[PDB]
Amino acid sequence: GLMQFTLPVRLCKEIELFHFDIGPFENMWPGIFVYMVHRSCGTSCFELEKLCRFIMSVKKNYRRVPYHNWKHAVTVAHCMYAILQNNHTLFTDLERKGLLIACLCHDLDHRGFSNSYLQKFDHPLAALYSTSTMEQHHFSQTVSILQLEGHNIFSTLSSSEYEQVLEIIRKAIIATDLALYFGNRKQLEEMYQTGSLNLNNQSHRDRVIGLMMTACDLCSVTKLWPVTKLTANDIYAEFWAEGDEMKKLGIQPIPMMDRDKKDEVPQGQLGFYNAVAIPCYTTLTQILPPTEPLLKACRDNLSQWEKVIRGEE
Ligand SMILES: Cc1cnc(C[S@@](=O)c2nc3ccc4ncsc4c3[nH]2)c(C)c1OC(C)C
Ligand SMILES: [Mg+2]
Ligand SMILES: [Zn+2]
């Protein structure tokens, strides 16, 4: 109860910033997450024995893939922590509890392959879940881990609070299906511009939580340039392996996944920042003004990718 987690001074300071990198020491990531839960939620939100056993089961159910791994889970949870801390009064106690856990769990048991590859492969998960295939798997895995003896971190919530937090987590994890992001941001863009956006409207909150999840999930593009660039290597290592597996099924992959088109990466990154990243953090910065540093970081990184094309790096 009186047991805080405490980080070294550089981490204590930098963890509060949107662009914090969690570092290469895996054995500190659990404590970094607990630290974030304690400051974001309170030292009473979770029984420490049950939270620590939840964190270690979640870690075990992430695989050794180049990008969609345990480090990504903790990184995405840190971005969410930064959003919640800079927007203190806007979120309920249940939402703060649920969203950090949703981020930690959002890619549980990822295999390093897109929904599209599962469908073309004819993977069993694609028969069980026709859309948001991996994302429904991730939520399924989250529920399974919550139901292990000793792993129910939500046990001290009332019946209705428990149903509300699982519903927050489910929507939050489904929203990380990027195929749903485009329509979600268009709607939010319309509602903000016509003035109809209303954070007391549950269907509006859902949409805003949806965009926060996309923003945390894409946060690789909001780091300092050297983190952004080195993370892109891991992203393309998964994508190119998937492209290799498409070719094995006798399907030419899209250029994004074809390692034979490495050359076009800088131009592909431009389209991505223009089509997805910038619109995302722009609409988020309109709805949640204190998240502006993410939009500034993203634009800085667009400019770094522009310089790569121009041969300046
Ligand atoms: C953070 C991040 C960084 N990079 C990417 C890849 S996106 O930049 C991209 N789009 C294209 C289109 C054509 C193309 N030809 C050769 S590489 C390449 C591309 N890379 C994604 C998808 C990303 O987000 C995924 C995690 C969804
Ligand atoms: Mg995912
Ligand atoms: Zn993710």
Word description of this protein:
- α8 runs antiparallel to α9 (159-174) and α10 (178-194) crosses α11 (202-217).
- The chain is mainly alpha-helical.
- It has helices spanning 9-14, 29-40, 48-60, 70-85, 93-105, 115-121, 124-128, 133-146, 159-174, 178-194, 202-217, 225-248, 265-287, 292-309.
- It has 14 helices and no strands.
- The protein has a single domain (28-310), classed as Catalytic domain of cyclic nucleotide phosphodiesterase 4b2b (Orthogonal Bundle).
- Zinc ion is lined by residues 72, 76, 106-107, 176, 217.
The strand count comes to 0
CATH H-level superfamily? 3'5'-cyclic nucleotide phosphodiesterase, catalytic domain
CATH fold description: Catalytic domain of cyclic nucleotide phosphodiesterase 4b2b
Radius of gyration (Å):
19 Å
- Please name the CATH architecture: Orthogonal Bundle
List the helices and strands in order. Answer: HHHHHHHHHHHHHH
Strand content: under 5%
Keywords: Allosteric enzyme, cAMP, cAMP-binding, cGMP, cGMP-binding, Cytoplasm, Disease variant, Hydrolase, Metal-binding, Nucleotide-binding, Phosphoprotein, Repeat
Binding site for 3',5'-cyclic GMP: 68, 269
Domain PDEase: 1-312
Active site: 68
